[PDB]
């Protein structure tokens, strides 16, 4: 086909799939098996990017991954789905009955995904805190795990499934193919070919784009639109969300108590953005991608400039004190808590991709060097044996990755994951020489 189609799955592949198989690196805190570096106690806290030996580039051949709150999914060349992390509510989609099976990356049985036998492939993975999703090249969505809420388990699908332990076909909810996923903490967004957005999961923070009264929370626990149309790109923080329209207008909704939605100078406790609201951005800026955590958001332009907004308590926004703008929110005690409008970061390289976990972030410079900042106590920034928060984007330099071209990054609650390829000796020396001279 129809004339309503504005999106194709191909439009997103550069963001998600690497052409080359990747060395996978993991770091931060893995007390709940998040690091996927196996069962040993020494390997549940890792302060610098560590090459993951369970995902060797020449055999596992990982080409994509999606990092959730407490678990990760990865995709290989033959479209097998690998998982590791916390399986307490089925998120790994495989039998795991640190726990060795949970802390060791392994494949979900191929039979668990019927489209694979038909020659279809996964084009995107998505992981929330407690749920997992795979989008297939034929528009089908497989999902597993559950959604939690403030007080416990909400459920998985309507009042029919509480916890889904194996991949499960989500009943069709559009006349168009699904083209993109955006996972939050306990909700997930879907985008279809015509630009309609659907939301599924917990809704206590208005993340579903509609108010849901208590007694309808299970009756309506399935992907549903909410009047948001003409969208070409979706992204999600934990409890807030972003949509970019065909006409280059960026809107946000959901949790906004730190101004993470970037819509207003006014910062107020318990604030929720109910109807999607436009972010003001200079006319110059074309949006490439967005990453968001619990209380901050990161907006990357096509030119490589990064705009941040939201919380400042753990340096989430990565703006140094002596450059905080005049619209910085200060509380009654005079402490700067938030930067509620998107604010361009200065004195940084141009970035090509960005990822955000709960209170930390990792961005990749055009030259393939990763930069991190934010909350430091769990070492998710991978900057070594220092607990203090990192104020501005800071180069990750360690033996394991110093000569790698970093291609993909992702972040969870207390940890981060990257994928890269070794530079040739020639290219590695050239980049090293370039970086040393500045």
């Amino acid at each position: 086909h129809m004339s309503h189609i504005i999106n194709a799955q191909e439009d997103y592949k550069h963001m998600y799939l690497s052409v080359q198989p990747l060395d996978i690196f993991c770091w931060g805190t893995g007390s709940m098996c998040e690091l996927g570096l196996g069962p040993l106690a020494k390997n549940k806290e890792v302060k610098r990017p560590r090459l993951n030996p369970f995902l060797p580039r020449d055999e596992a051949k990982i080409i994509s991954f999606a990092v959730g709150g407490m678990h990760t999914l990865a995709l290989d060349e033959e479209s097998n789905v690998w998982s590791w992390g916390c399986n307490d509510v089925g998120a790994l989609g495989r039998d795991t009955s640190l726990n060795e099976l949970e802390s060791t990356p392994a494949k979900i049985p191929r039979e668990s995904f019927p489209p694979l036998a038909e020659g279809h492939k996964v084009v995107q993975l998505a992981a929330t805190d407690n749920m997992s999703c795979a989008l297939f090249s034929n528009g089908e969505v497989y999902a597993w795990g559950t959604f939690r809420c403030n007080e416990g388990i909400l459920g998985f699908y309507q009042d029919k499934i509480k916890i889904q332990k194996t991949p499960w076909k989500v009943p069709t909810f559009s006349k168009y193919n699904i083209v993109q996923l955006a996972p939050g903490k306990d909700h997930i967004l879907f985008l279809d070919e015509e630009g309609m957005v659907f939301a599924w999961g917990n809704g206590q923070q208005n993340q579903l784009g509609r108010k849901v009264m208590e007694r309808f929370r299970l009756k309506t626990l399935d992907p549903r639109p909410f009047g948001l149309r003409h969208v070409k790109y979706i992204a999600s923080g934990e409890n807030h969300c972003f949509a970019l329209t065909k006409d280059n207008k960026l809107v946000s909704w959901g949790l906004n108590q730190f101004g993470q939605c970037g819509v207003s100078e006014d910062v107020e406790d318990g604030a929720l953005v109910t109807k999607p609201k436009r972010l003001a951005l200079p006319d110059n800026v074309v949006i490439r991608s967005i990453a968001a955590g619990e209380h901050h958001s990161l907006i990357l332009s096509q030119d490589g400039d990064l705009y941040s907004c939201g919380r400042l308590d753990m340096f989430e926004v990565g703006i140094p004190k002596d450059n905080l703008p005049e619209y910085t929110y200060k509380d009654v005690h005079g402490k700067a808590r938030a930067v509620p409008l998107p604010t361009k970061l200065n004195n940084v390289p141009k970035f090509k991709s960005v990822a955000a976990g709960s209170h930390h972030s990792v961005a990749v410079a055009q030259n393939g060097i990763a930069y991190s900042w934010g909350f430091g106590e769990t070492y998710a920034v991978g900057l070594g044996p220092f607990e203090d928060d990192t104020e501005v984007p800071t180069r990750i330099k360690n033996t394991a990755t110093q000569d790698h071209n970093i291609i993909l990054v992702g972040c969870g609650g207390q940890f981060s994951v990257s994928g890269g390829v070794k530079l040739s000796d020639e290219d590695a020396e050239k980049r090293a020489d370039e970086m040393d001279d500045l």
Side-chain angles (χ1 to χ4, degrees), residues 239-245 248 250-267 270-274 276-277 279-282 285-286:
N239 298 310
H240 62 115
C241 309
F242 292 91
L244 176 66
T245 58
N248 198 232
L250 181 60
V251 294
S252 55
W253 66 100
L255 182 68
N256 198 36
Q257 88 279 229
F258 291 96
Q260 59 265 53
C261 287
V263 290
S264 172
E265 290 202 8
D266 291 332
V267 168
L272 306 171
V273 179
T274 54
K277 196 160 176 174
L279 286 84
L281 276 307
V285 29
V286 179

Side-chain angles (χ1 to χ4, degrees), residues 28-57 60-69 71-159 161-174 176-210 212-245:
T29 298
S31 71
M32 290 174 290
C33 298
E34 302 100 308
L35 295 179
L37 290 168
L40 298 177
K42 54 182 263 203
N43 289 325
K44 77 205 215 68
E45 182 186 82
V46 170
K47 302 174 186 184
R48 292 295 201 162
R50 174 87 58 81
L51 179 70
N52 193 310
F54 303 106
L55 302 166
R57 187 188 74 256
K61 303 180 175 171
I62 300 307
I63 46 84
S64 196
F65 58 82
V67 182
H71 67 108
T72 303
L73 309 173
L75 191 68
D76 66 29
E77 283 175 7
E78 292 321 305
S79 192
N80 290 298
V81 182
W82 297 63
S83 66
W84 68 91
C86 186
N87 209 16
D88 285 342
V89 288
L92 306 190
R94 61 183 178 85
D95 189 6
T96 56
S97 60
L98 300 177
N99 186 108
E100 200 190 320
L101 293 170
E102 288 172 78
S103 64
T104 304
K107 286 178 279 180
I108 295 175
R110 206 167 169 88
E111 317 90 67
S112 297
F113 302 105
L116 294 175
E118 306 214 309
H120 305 296
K121 281 176 183 54
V122 177
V123 302
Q124 193 191 346
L125 292 171
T128 68
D129 273 24
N130 307 111
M131 83 79 67
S132 292
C133 190
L135 174 62
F136 283 84
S137 52
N138 69 347
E140 294 195 342
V141 172
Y142 275 65
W144 59 104
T146 197
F147 307 103
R148 286 183 188 272
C149 57
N150 297 346
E151 44 273 301
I153 296 160
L154 180 49
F156 176 76
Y157 197 84
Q158 300 175 333
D159 211 346
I161 305 156
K162 174 178 191 184
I163 295 167
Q164 184 56 41
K165 292 176 174 168
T166 52
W168 176 82
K169 190 184 174 191
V170 180
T172 309
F173 50 89
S174 176
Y176 295 88
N177 279 3
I178 303 309
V179 302
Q180 197 196 7
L181 315 174
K185 175 190 180 73
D186 280 301
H187 70 95
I188 181 170
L189 305 181
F190 305 88
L191 181 61
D192 76 11
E193 296 178 278
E194 74 163 339
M196 190 73 78
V197 187
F198 302 81
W200 179 29
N202 193 38
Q204 298 173 302
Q205 292 77 37
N206 256 282
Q207 56 269 70
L208 308 174
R210 61 191 171 92
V212 188
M213 287 181 18
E214 177 70 7
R215 74 185 180 275
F216 299 105
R217 290 174 73 206
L218 289 177
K219 285 170 189 172
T220 68
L221 187 66
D222 57 275
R224 286 167 188 241
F226 48 95
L228 180 58
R229 287 163 284 262
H230 314 118
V231 174
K232 62 159 179 286
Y233 173 82
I234 51 165
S236 189
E238 291 196 4
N239 298 310
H240 62 115
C241 309
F242 292 91
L244 176 66
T245 58

